[PDB]
Design a protein around this nucleic acid. Structure first.
Length: 64
DNA sequence: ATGAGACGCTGGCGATTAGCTAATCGCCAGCGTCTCATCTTTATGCGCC
């Protein structure tokens, strides 16, 4: 209780510190471990990586 | 050369039967962050028609 880790759930409030890099790492690992079977995700793994990596610049604004 | 005209317990109960806002108060209110830039504006400090 004093160490604040008593029965903590998984989807909690402290996840705001989690960067996107580790999710991208786990994504690349899953893709590389599954690209040896299916051809389409082996072909479009960099597309999915682009989906996760894509961030609209602040100077662009609305994509109207 | 005769055969119509003249019409009731209700009111005062109960007792069904049916139906409706209003006055008082309490509760309780989606919120969390960051980045990035962007401009202002203020406090003080310096100049004479």
């Amino acid at each position: 209780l004093n160490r604040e880790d008593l029965l903590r759930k998984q989807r909690t409030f402290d996840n705001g510190s989690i960067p996107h890099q580790i999710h991208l790492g786990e994504l690349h690992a899953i893709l590389r471990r599954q690209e040896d079977f299916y051809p389409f995700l082996k072909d479009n793994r960099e597309k999915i990586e682009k989906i996760l990596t894509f961030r609209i610049p602040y100077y662009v604004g609305p994509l109207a």
